[PDB]
């Protein structure tokens, strides 16, 4: 539901809902990266 | 043509050997009665090979001559290559 994103420029975690323009509440920068997931990752060292 | 007038080779060519084996092993695969007592082998291709070696395949070959005539050669009656 929250789906916190990351600004490309100022690296600020900012709340965005669904069906909103991709905007950062500061710096007006328009490219967002999502996050790292919460589910478990298991890597063999091979 | 009559049995007296047979001009084709008495050797079963490689194409006849391939197609007869295929079409007889297909029949064995559709549960046709085998002509040779098997020793427990289950593969229809090997069953057809054994029947060909024993000269028991219940199939004859119609060799069409170029003029339009034909000859009926029984598999038991012509020489197998291998």
């Amino acid at each position: 539901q929250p789906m916190i994103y990351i600004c490309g420029e100022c690296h600020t975690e900012n709340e965005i809902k669904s069906r909103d323009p991709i905007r950062c509440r500061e710096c007006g920068y328009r490219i967002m990266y999502k996050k790292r997931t919460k589910r478990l990752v298991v890597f063999d060292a091979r | 043509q009559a049995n007296q007038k047979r001009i084709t080779t008495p050797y079963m060519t490689k194409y006849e050997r391939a197609r007869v084996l295929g079409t007889r092993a297909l029949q064995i695969a559709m549960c046709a009665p085998v002509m040779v007592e098997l020793e427990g082998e289950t593969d229809p291709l090997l069953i057809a090979m054994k029947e060909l070696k024993a000269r028991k395949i219940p199939i004859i070959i119609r060799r069409y001559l170029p003029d339009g005539s034909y000859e009926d050669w029984g598999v038991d009656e012509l020489i197998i290559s291998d």
Partner: protein, 525 residues
């Protein structure tokens, strides 16, 4: 020439050409003339001097740059027209001296003959010791060797991005690599190759790899593929990113959609596989129909990062990049810097691999039967100089026309470090332990890993998807297509005389169909 050498009125790019036997004297100023810099030679002496070299060696403080060197009247730009009417010398020392006279009337000299090469051919060590088709093939495969292609590859959301874990600058290099910045972004690893016939799994131009080295990270890389999607297109058919819900949306694959977040995308760091939804996109149905993007079949990677933004139309735009590491397996195409390509044939562990008197087991074993017809003597000299360099501590020099290094000098240098002067060593069999009767040629050589992995080429089919116009199997690995039983394969089957197999290939295995035709007229009914 006097004005051009001082840049008074005539700029350097302008070329003046005097045809002498035919009285024309032509001056060219237009664009597109291809030219290269050459030194200026008076009576028999260069205008380049110790003072020029000294004041230019202390650059970044005296700022005596190439432009100042041109302004000094030391070098000129000579195009082909002016190259016809000029006399060059390959090397000032060897071609401007008192001897049995050849020309004694030189006009220009070349800075270094190795500059006749390009970019991909300037990374070839000892390129004059190879057959030219080998050099051409290496220049072609240098564009396919995987490495750090750019420093900002993580911000660069790009499809088909290939980077190697542990790139290395070559132990033996040309003096022209420092200008290609190849020692800053290299593509390859300095492997220890043993040119020997070990088991036979490298016979036809193939190669054995060390399984233990691959486990340790030898030629291990990661494959970046990026997926883009944008929502929109009609009056009411609005595209939207969301999780498609079964009771609402009509058309759905068996793929599991729980991996998506409720905004319709996967969070970075989630394991993904073939036929797994990545971008959940649905279009309103005048309930709804999805246009979700599925991960390419048999990719089986991990999402690296997910970016959302707005395109120039102001619509939501998403690009997703997926990591997938490619551990070197058998069949992966490997090549050297001499046009000696080859796919891995088998991977033996360190125990199974031959070894020296020490514990040195070759990372790579190639067939010796690849040298004599290819005649890549540059490969052997590279393998020798690599051992010499790795023992000396120096970086080997493989300038093409150096003439200051040769096989005899390299052998004499190697003999000082406790090795056979010709690079051969006494390897022991990895299985039996008996020392190999012949002595094995072994040494560090710069091998490259090409993009032609086998997991990106392998595909099969068993009654998959079908084209729309003619009901034949689709074409392409991505579309789960079928191979083409072409006109020459048809001819080969005719020659075999397999008519039933030909009909099976072209009729049942492609497009069996039944039609009804009238007996009176041969027209379809």
């Amino acid at each position: 020439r006097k004005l051009r050498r001082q840049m008074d009125i005539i700029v350097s790019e302008v070329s003046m050409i005097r045809d002498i036997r035919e009285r024309e004297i032509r001056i060219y100023t237009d664009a597109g003339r291809i030219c290269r810099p050459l030194l200026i030679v008076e009576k028999q002496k260069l205008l380049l001097k110790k003072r020029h070299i000294d004041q230019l060696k202390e650059r970044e403080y005296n700022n005596y740059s190439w432009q100042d060197l041109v302004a000094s009247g030391v070098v000129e730009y000579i195009d082909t027209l002016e190259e016809e009417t000029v006399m060059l010398a390959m090397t000032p020392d060897d071609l401007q001296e008192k001897e049995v006279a050849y020309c004694s009337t030189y006009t220009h000299c070349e800075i270094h003959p190795s500059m006749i090469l390009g970019v991909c051919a300037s990374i070839i060590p000892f390129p004059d010791h190879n057959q030219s088709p080998r050099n051409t093939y290496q220049s072609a495969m240098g564009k396919q060797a995987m490495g750090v292609y750019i420093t900002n590859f993580h911000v660069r959301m790009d499809t088909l991005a290939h980077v190697l874990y542990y790139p290395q600058k070559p132990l033996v290099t040309t003096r022209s690599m420092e200008y290609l910045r190849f020692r800053e972004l290299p593509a390859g690893i300095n492997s220890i190759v043993a040119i020997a016939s070990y088991t036979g799994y490298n016979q036809e131009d193939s190669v054995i790899m060390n399984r233990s080295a691959v486990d340790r990270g030898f030629f291990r890389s990661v494959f970046y593929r990026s997926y883009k999607e944008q929502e929109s297109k009609g009056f009411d058919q609005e595209e939207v990113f969301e999780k498609p819900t079964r009771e609402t949306c009509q058309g759905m694959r068996h793929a599991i959609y729980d991996k998506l977040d409720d905004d319709g995308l996967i969070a970075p760091g989630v394991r993904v596989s073939g036929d797994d939804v990545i971008i959940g996109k649905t279009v309103t149905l005048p309930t709804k129909r999805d246009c979700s993007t599925f991960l390419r079949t048999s990719e089986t990677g991990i999402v690296d990062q997910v970016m959302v933004t707005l395109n120039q139309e102001g619509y939501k735009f998403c690009k997703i990049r997926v990591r997938s590491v490619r551990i070197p397996q058998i069949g992966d195409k490997f090549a050297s810097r001499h046009g000696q390509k080859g796919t891995c044939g088998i991977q033996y562990r360190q125990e199974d691999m031959p070894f020296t008197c020490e514990g040195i087991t070759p990372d790579i074993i190639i067939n010796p039967h690849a040298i004599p017809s290819r005649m890549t003597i540059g490969h052997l000299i590279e393998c020798l100089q690599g051992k010499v360099s790795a023992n000396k501590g120096e970086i080997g020099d493989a300038t093409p026309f150096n003439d200051a290094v040769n096989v005899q000098k390299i052998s004499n240098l190697l003999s000082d470090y406790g090795y056979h002067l010709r690079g051969n060593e006494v390897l022991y069999n990895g299985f039996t332990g008996r020392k190999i009767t012949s002595q094995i040629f072994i040494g560090p050589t710069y091998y490259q890993r090409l993009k032609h992995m086998v997991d990106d080429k392998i595909h099969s089919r068993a009654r998959g998807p079908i084209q729309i116009l003619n009901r034949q199997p689709m074409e392409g690995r991505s579309r789960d297509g079928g191979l083409r039983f072409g006109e020459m394969e048809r001819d080969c089957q005719i020659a075999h005389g397999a008519a039933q197999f030909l009909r099976e290939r072209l009729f049942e295995a492609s497009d069996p169909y039944q039609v009804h035709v009238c007996n009176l007229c041969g027209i379809m009914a």
